[PDB]
Design a protein around this ligand. Structure first.
Ligand SMILES: Nc1ncnc2c1ncn2[C@@H]1O[C@H](COP(=O)(O)OP(=O)(O)OP(=O)(O)OP(=O)(O)OC[C@H]2O[C@@H](n3cnc4c(N)ncnc43)[C@H](O)[C@@H]2O)[C@@H](O)[C@H]1O
Ligand SMILES: Nc1ncnc2c1ncn2[C@@H]1O[C@H](COP(=O)(O)OP(=O)(O)OP(=O)(O)OP(=O)(O)OC[C@H]2O[C@@H](n3cnc4c(N)ncnc43)[C@H](O)[C@@H]2O)[C@@H](O)[C@H]1O
Ligand SMILES: Nc1ncnc2c1ncn2[C@@H]1O[C@H](COP(=O)(O)OP(=O)(O)OP(=O)(O)OP(=O)(O)OC[C@H]2O[C@@H](n3cnc4c(N)ncnc43)[C@H](O)[C@@H]2O)[C@@H](O)[C@H]1O
Ligand SMILES: [Mg+2]
Ligand SMILES: [Mg+2]
Ligand SMILES: [Mg+2]
Lengths: 401, 85, 401
């Protein structure tokens, strides 16, 4: 009753980071973060498990840049496991390509192309190939007037080196495997050297789990899809139902990476860790609904710091899921103690975001500017890597002016 | 007035090159005149068509000065006679 | 980790100056400031080394009023040394005047005039003189119908007194030196009694230096141009590259005045002083970019006070480069401990500012109003001179209301 109003809380706009001596330039800063022994990122950015942010396209783009994507749970157990599998199997350089027959018309091909592939190999038991440049000399007509005689095909097992070469020789960008190896397929295997991967070189991916009756079956299929981390995502993780679900999943899958639902106090962070969570996601009402509707909330900087302080007593990790609005907030969120930040609204309108509906272009645009601001902030702070920003950077408290 | 009278000249004088030149030479021509193709002749005098080089050809090469002869299209080379419609 | 959020920070709008007993009127206040033993100002105002603020015109106007101009570095090493030399050679009362020949036309003269001179003496191996009033009786014609017979010329070495007299006698305002001495040239040698000058009576000037590969050559030519102070200007002076550049310049030119790049902590101020800087420029994110992009910043009043406290332990000087928006902020910035303020945005649109592009008129308009407010503030505080404002004026902390 007497300590009812003792606590104080700071948000992003209450603090600024203080410059310190710096021996490193913003570009030479290390942005890698080790969430668990088996979940390492090269940039500390995670796309949220929301149906407006992250499906397989976003998760692949996020992982390609060194981050992580969380497949949302607003889909059936079967679809979500397919989304996870689609990310894990990517960057292999195509066993199931799109196909047509000589009976179809070019109108079928163009629409299959528009829905962004540029080549369609030509029933149940290879005759040709039709591409975009073939469409320039055509007038939907019929697809049998395709590239039928001059067909360059490879064997199944042909190496990428045994390509980028057959292709350069025949000046062709597609190579069917009588499968498919393209030339974008070969070059995207080099364009992303910072790609976050598991120990077998596959792109990492995460999947969202709630606390319902079928989440044990959902986790089962996601684990069977080689998901790298399960995000038990709830509005209040300090509930007993979340704690029990965390423990039941830990005891069933002892080595599975687990991220647990939004909390904002050290006490809740300890409960989630003791239940078996590897990573604690932080953010309770970071004029959002929770504050207006329920009167509940914690200023995010205070939440990050209090939860980070508790989590690193146990050697565990914090994810800052909340009100990041500029690149400078990422620098504050991590310097306050967070190991990685989660984004949703910032990435919701990008090209790799779900649906076609505000358009924001490729998500690489946004992540580049956000990471660029982080690098600039770590330069001012002299932050060698992310632990130095976390453990040593100092803040200055500001009046609102 | 003269610029309009000379607009539609029908190209009788085509801009050409020889396999001796480097691939850079070809990009120069394409980039300078917004041209997408250079026909390659055996010599400056006996202008005899040996090959043709184009941008889609340039795409298939990392920047290189290799002789255009190992770069150009020669085997399935398609021409037409003077006077074809 | 525990002192991560301990520090507090104050900006201009958080504080007000408290009136004290006053024995001096605002007009009898001394505004002189001694930045170094060889860099003294009569007003504590410095125009910033920005390509939108300070070139030779601004530096001359600033020095004429008792301040200082910093020639920006967005030009070649040769141009910048020419800009410095153009300021150092001014107020001599013209060895290289504009010239024409009897073959040219009056249209050539008017345009040479418009680009603000009023007289053009009339090849490689004096025949006439053409002026603005001659143009009233002309019709571009040809320049040979000029003032050709009635030519009043003086010898090289004629004293100003040997003028203001030849001119008053012949009622003419131009006097060629078969060079040029005008009448504005003679009167501007008296109009500016507060002009800040070196020990040889030349207007002081400063030049901007970064930390690149050729800055040692840049400093070499600027020193050869008799620059009074070098401003090593960077976004983060607490970097090791800045410290090394400061030391290398100090060891090469031991008596050269050095102002060092933006810092906002006592620790950085000590580093810059120990590296060899004479004056430390203060201002890191004083909703600017640094705060939004990097999350870094220090409220300027706290920055000035902390850096001033450290600097005067070593007997050195602080320049307040930041968010001054009214004349009252100058009074706060100096009372917080700064010895002089740097301005950029306020002077960017003035007549003496670079280019023709918001127009703000002569820069003497702005500096007069800004200094007028400072004088008024020192009157309220009873501040005899600038040290009394710095060392004795008290502030009151205000809620935002
Ligand atoms: N069926 C499918 N199933 C699954 N995923 C698929 C897919 N098709 C594409 N994808 C995916 O789509 C991604 C996007 O890459 P692409 O769509 O391949 O994009 P690109 O490499 O830039 O091709 P571009 O658009 O330049 O081709 P163009 O017609 O100009 O130039 C192509 C030229 O190649 C020639 N060509 C192709 N095969 C030929 C052959 N056998 N013989 C002769 N010419 C051939 C054509 O005639 C034409 O001139 C790929 O990475 C892949 O993952
Ligand atoms: N020397 C010259 N002198 C004067 N005016 C000139 C000129 N050259 C061009 N011009 C003028 O410039 C314009 C010609 O260029 P544009 O007509 O404007 O260009 P485009 O064909 O639209 O280019 P694109 O990029 O699609 O073609 P690609 O590389 O795929 O190229 C076609 C594809 O087919 C292949 N190909 C072309 N000809 C071939 C042939 N004979 N045999 C085999 N393959 C051939 C190529 O390898 C490539 O893959 C016209 O105004 C023309 O009059
Ligand atoms: N060539 C040059 N090179 C470098 N810097 C230059 C320059 N010319 C000017 N500047 C600079 O420009 C600055 C601006 O000062 P000015 O341009 O001299 O401005 P001012 O003194 O106010 O002259 P005003 O505009 O009143 O002259 P007006 O024609 O009415 O009255 C002038 C009268 O003088 C008479 N006059 C001049 N010389 C005469 C002569 N030898 N014999 C007879 N009459 C003569 C004319 O006929 C006319 O009636 C100078 O301080 C100087 O630094
Ligand atoms: Mg294409
Ligand atoms: Mg083409
Ligand atoms: Mg006049």
């Amino acid at each position: 009753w007497e300590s009812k109003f003792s606590k104080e809380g700071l948000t992003f706009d209450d603090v600024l980071l203080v410059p310190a001596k710096s021996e490193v330039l913003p570009r030479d800063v290390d942005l890698s973060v080790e969430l668990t022994k088996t979940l390492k990122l090269n940039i500390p950015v995670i796309s949220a498990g929301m149906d407006t942010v992250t499906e397989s396209a976003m998760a692949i783009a996020m992982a390609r840049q060194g981050g992580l994507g969380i497949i949302h749970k607003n889909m059936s157990i079967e679809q979500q496991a397919e989304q996870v599998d689609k990310v894990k199997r990517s960057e292999r350089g195509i066993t199931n390509p799109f196909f047509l027959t000589p009976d179809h018309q070019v109108f079928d091909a163009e629409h299959l192309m528009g829905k962004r592939i540029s080549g369609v190999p030509i029933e149940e038991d290879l005759v040709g190939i039709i591409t975009n440049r073939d469409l320039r000399f055509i007038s939907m007509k019929i697809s049998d007037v395709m590239t039928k005689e001059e067909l360059v095909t490879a064997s199944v097992g042909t190496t990428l080196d045994e390509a980028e070469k057959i292709l350069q020789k025949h000046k062709i960008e597609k190579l069917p495997l009588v499968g498919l190896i393209t030339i974008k397929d070969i070059e995207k295997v080099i364009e992303f050297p910072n790609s976050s991967k598991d120990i077998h070189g596959r792109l990492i991916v995460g999947a969202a789990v709630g606390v319902t009756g079928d989440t044990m079956t959902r986790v089962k299929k996601l684990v069977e899809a080689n998901v790298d981390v399960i995000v038990i995502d709830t509005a209040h993780g300090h509930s007993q139902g979340v704690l029990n679900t965390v423990t039941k999943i830990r005891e069933t899958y002892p080595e599975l990476n687990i991220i647990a639902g939004n909390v904002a106090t050290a006490e809740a962070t300890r409960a989630l860790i003791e239940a078996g969570a590897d990573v604690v996601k932080v953010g309770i009402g970071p004029i959002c609904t929770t504050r207006v509707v329920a009167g509940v909330g914690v200023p995010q900087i205070t939440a990050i710091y209090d939860c980070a302080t508790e989590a690193r007593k146990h050697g565990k990790t914090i994810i800052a899921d909340g009100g990041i609005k500029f690149s400078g907030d990422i620098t504050k969120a991590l310097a306050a103690g967070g190991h990685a930040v989660m984004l949703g609204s910032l990435l919701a309108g990008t090209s790799e975001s779900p649906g076609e509906t505000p358009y924001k272009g490729p998500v690489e645009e946004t992540v580049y500017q956000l990471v660029g601001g982080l690098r600039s902030g770590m330069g001012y702070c002299g932050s060698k890597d992310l632990r130095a920003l976390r453990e040593e950077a100092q803040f200055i408290r500001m009046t609102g002016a | 007035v003269d610029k309009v009278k000379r607009s539609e000249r029908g190209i009788t004088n085509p801009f050409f090159l020889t396999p001796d030149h480097q691939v850079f030479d070809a990009e120069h021509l394409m980039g300078k005149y917004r041209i997408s193709g250079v026909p390659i002749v055996n010599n400056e005098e006996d202008q005899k068509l040996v090959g043709i080089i184009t941008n889609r050809d340039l795409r298939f090469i990392a920047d290189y000065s290799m002789k255009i002869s190992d770069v150009m299209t020669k085997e399935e080379l398609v021409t037409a006679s003077v006077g074809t419609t």
